[PDB]
Amino acid sequence: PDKLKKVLDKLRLKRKDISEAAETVNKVVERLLRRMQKRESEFKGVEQLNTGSYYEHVKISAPNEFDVMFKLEVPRIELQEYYETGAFYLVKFKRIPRGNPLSHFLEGEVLSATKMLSKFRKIIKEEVKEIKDIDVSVEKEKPGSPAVTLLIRNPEEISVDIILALESKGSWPISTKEGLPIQGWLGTKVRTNLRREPFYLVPKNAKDGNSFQGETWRLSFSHTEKYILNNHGIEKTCCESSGAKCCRKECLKLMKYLLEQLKKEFQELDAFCSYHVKTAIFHMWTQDPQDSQWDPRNLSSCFDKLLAFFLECLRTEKLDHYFIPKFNLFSQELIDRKSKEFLSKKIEYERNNGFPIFDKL
Amino acid sequence: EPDKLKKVLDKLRLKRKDISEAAETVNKVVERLLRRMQKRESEFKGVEQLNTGSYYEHVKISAPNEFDVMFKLEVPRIELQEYYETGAFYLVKFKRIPRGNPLSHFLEGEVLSATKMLSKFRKIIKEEVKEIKDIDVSVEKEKPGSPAVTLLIRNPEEISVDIILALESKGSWPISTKEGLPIQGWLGTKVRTNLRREPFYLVPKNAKDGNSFQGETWRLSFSHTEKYILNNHGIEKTCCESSGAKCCRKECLKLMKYLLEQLKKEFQELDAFCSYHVKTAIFHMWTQDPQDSQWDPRNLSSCFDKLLAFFLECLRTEKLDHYFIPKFNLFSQELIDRKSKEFLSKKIEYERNNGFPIFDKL
Numbered sequence A: 001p002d003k004l005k006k007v008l009d010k011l012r013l014k015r016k017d018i019s020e021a022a023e024t025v026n027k028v029v030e031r032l033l034r035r036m037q038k039r040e041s042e043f044k045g046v047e048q049l050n051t052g053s054y055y056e057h058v059k060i061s062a063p064n065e066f067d068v069m070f071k072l073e074v075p076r077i078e079l080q081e082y083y084e085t086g087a088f089y090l091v092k093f094k095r096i097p098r099g100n101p102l103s104h105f106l107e108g109e110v111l112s113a114t115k116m117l118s119k120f121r122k123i124i125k126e127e128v129k130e131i132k133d134i135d136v137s138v139e140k141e142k143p144g145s146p147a148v149t150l151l152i153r154n155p156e157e158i159s160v161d162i163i164l165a166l167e168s169k170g171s172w173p174i175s176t177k178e179g180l181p182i183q184g185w186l187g188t189k190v191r192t193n194l195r196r197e198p199f200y201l202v203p204k205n206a207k208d209g210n211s212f213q214g215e216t217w218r219l220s221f222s223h224t225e226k227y228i229l230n231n232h233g234i235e236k237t238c239c240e241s242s243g244a245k246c247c248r249k250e251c252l253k254l255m256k257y258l259l260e261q262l263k264k265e266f267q268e269l270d271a272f273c274s275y276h277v278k279t280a281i282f283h284m285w286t287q288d289p290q291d292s293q294w295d296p297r298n299l300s301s302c303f304d305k306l307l308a309f310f311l312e313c314l315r316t317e318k319l320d321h322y323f324i325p326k327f328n329l330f331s332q333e334l335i336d337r338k339s340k341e342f343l344s345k346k347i348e349y350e351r352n353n354g355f356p357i358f359d360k361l
Numbered sequence B: 001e002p003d004k005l006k007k008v009l010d011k012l013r014l015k016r017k018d019i020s021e022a023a024e025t026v027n028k029v030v031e032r033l034l035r036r037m038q039k040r041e042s043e044f045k046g047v048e049q050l051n052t053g054s055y056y057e058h059v060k061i062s063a064p065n066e067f068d069v070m071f072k073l074e075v076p077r078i079e080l081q082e083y084y085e086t087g088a089f090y091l092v093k094f095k096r097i098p099r100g101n102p103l104s105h106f107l108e109g110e111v112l113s114a115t116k117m118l119s120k121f122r123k124i125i126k127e128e129v130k131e132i133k134d135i136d137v138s139v140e141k142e143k144p145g146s147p148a149v150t151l152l153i154r155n156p157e158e159i160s161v162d163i164i165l166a167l168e169s170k171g172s173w174p175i176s177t178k179e180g181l182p183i184q185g186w187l188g189t190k191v192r193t194n195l196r197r198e199p200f201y202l203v204p205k206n207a208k209d210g211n212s213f214q215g216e217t218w219r220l221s222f223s224h225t226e227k228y229i230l231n232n233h234g235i236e237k238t239c240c241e242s243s244g245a246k247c248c249r250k251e252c253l254k255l256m257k258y259l260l261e262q263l264k265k266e267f268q269e270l271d272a273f274c275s276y277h278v279k280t281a282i283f284h285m286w287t288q289d290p291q292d293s294q295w296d297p298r299n300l301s302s303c304f305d306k307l308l309a310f311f312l313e314c315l316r317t318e319k320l321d322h323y324f325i326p327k328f329n330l331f332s333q334e335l336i337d338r339k340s341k342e343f344l345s346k347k348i349e350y351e352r353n354n355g356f357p358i359f360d361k362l
């Protein structure tokens, strides 16, 4: 049963796609950002959110993807809750427009996400050619994506995600109030210092139906989420140099590789993404706060505990958003029962047979 | 010992603890320094970066402190006049300078000047560096002999980077490296041919002669080819790959380098030794032991001891030839004196018998 340790060791693909193949992807990025803070464009104050992808972190789960956020601070913005999702909002301007080039993107009173993204893409889709240094290309604007992905073809088929995000330094939305329950895990001292940080809105189309197509934004917690990924232990020295290790990131990497390899053969699992796993292991980390329950010498037990948690999540159709309690990710609106019962069958099959899907020599 | 060589390599992840962020900052500053250094009216307009690996410079000499980067400028048809009989030191003489060349004014007669060329380079880098905006990056005073242009990248504390200028010549390799790189029975004659149809480089480092004229001596560097050997270190192409087996080659290299640093950082008496003595000794060791099976991760305790016994051999026998230049003996009597070679012999032998107590840093 100590073969998982050999899956984890084989998982690392160091330089290929992460080390020398990730500090090149950075180099392209800051070129774009610098040059993107050029002229008199609405985005002259665009900035790269402090996040972790390039620093050997895109390499843990879902290695075939790259991601970056371009934040852009806004003024006093009123948030109109979009129906009852708790995550999709309608961005308005608190006090009447005076000094902001973001009035070019106003559809009525609300800030339209398509007009802004449609023009965002046009600038980036114009300044990547303005440099010849490497072979970088951009993807098509497909529905659902609030990103402008750069398929660069230096390292196989890379696709660095550029995600425009609205930064609001005000208090967090009221739908995230009972969320982030890290009191008994990380502490009320850590939880408070994270909620006084700005929250971000990504231009995701809430496709509820007939109402606003591209005027809806979504709450992004990628900044807070990686503060939890690197600071996951109850001891501050967890997985540090002068500290003890744990199997939290490894039990995260194994569930991502399990769901990633399952979706490659079944297109009926096109309803589950890596964020279902992320949020699942957050509920499991909060349930088991002590680092003793995640000792590296219990990788098979901790992974089986996480698998039985994801099976109960599917089984009862209840995987609440870690920051937004009322927002249930495994709602029947979003995922039909048949997919839950289909994915339960494969995860159980791989769990009862020594994980044959990880059979890589 | 109680199999603690693997727990030392795992703690050598300190890279991540403190050099991850700094490596992006070095990447991001050099790049803005390089692209801003591609401006007109600068003889280095056509300068580039020689890709000699990455910032996680732990692969070579895993040092948790300072760094190095190399700049390559392509020159036209050099005539390498060997500096007397070094093998590594030359004089860059020019045959016909093609009209329109930016290296015309760096000659002190028939011979190219490393002292001059390294003057405007430092000069231009001093200019450009302070026009970089929100970042506090200044340059140090030029320490003597030292042929680089170290950069002080003020942020969290200190961040040094040696900006090493190096001429690129896509021509032929000198005669002194004609029997060097003996990878014929390890990496193959089919890859040694390709690695030598690749350019060679020259760094502005003066030789130590109280006589003749050592102001403009250039030195051979093979850091571009040394890198390939590190990442392509096995007889089997799938060594340390996804669909292959692992090996303790680079494993031993980090151990051997951290052993010498901690020893160097303990006594100044070991100041004559550098990280290139253990990279070169492991090149001969990988050539002597070519099979992947001879470097098995389950035999890390013995594969490292065997590397120790080979390195001490090179000390007590005073023989450690430059891997690309058979003539140049790095452990010669004129480079390092017997007194320092016996000192390191007792210190390494001391650690080897007592289970390496110098690695005790939990």
Ligand SMILES: Nc1nc(=O)c2ncn([C@@H]3O[C@@H]4COP(=O)(O)O[C@H]5[C@@H](O)[C@H](n6cnc7c(N)ncnc76)O[C@@H]5COP(=O)(O)O[C@@H]3[C@@H]4O)c2[nH]1
Residues within 6 Å of the ligand: A065, A067, A068, A069, A144, A145, A146, A147, A161, A163, A202, A219, A220, A221, A222, A273, A274, A275
């Ligand atoms: N860096 C970043 N921060 C974000 O907030 C974000 N939100 C979306 N994306 C990227 O946009 C696309 C989302 O479309 P899709 O729904 O079909 O699948 C997505 C999406 O449904 C879901 N998802 C990802 N991040 C979030 C998030 N932060 N909150 C809710 N759902 C998310 O998981 C899938 C893949 O996520 P990523 O691998 O992070 O990159 C996604 C992807 O490019 C984001 N990228």
Ligand SMILES: Nc1nc(=O)c2ncn([C@@H]3O[C@@H]4COP(=O)(O)O[C@H]5[C@@H](O)[C@H](n6cnc7c(N)ncnc76)O[C@@H]5COP(=O)(O)O[C@@H]3[C@@H]4O)c2[nH]1
Residues within 6 Å of the ligand: B052, B061, B068, B069, B070, B146, B147, B148, B162, B164, B203, B220, B221, B222, B223, B274, B275, B276
């Ligand atoms: N990237 C790079 N390629 C070079 O050829 C090179 N040559 C010198 N340097 C750097 O210049 C200084 C050398 O002065 P010192 O002799 O006291 O110690 C040097 C020098 O004695 C020795 N050396 C000899 N040949 C090489 C070589 N081909 N590559 C690296 N180091 C070499 O190595 C020692 C330091 O190693 P580095 O860690 O690579 O960085 C050095 C350092 O900043 C180089 N840096």
Ligand SMILES: [Zn+2]
Residues within 6 Å of the ligand: A232, A233, A238, A239, A244, A245, A246, A247, A248
């Ligand atoms: Zn940990």
Ligand SMILES: [Zn+2]
Residues within 6 Å of the ligand: B233, B234, B239, B240, B245, B246, B247, B248, B249
């Ligand atoms: Zn190998």
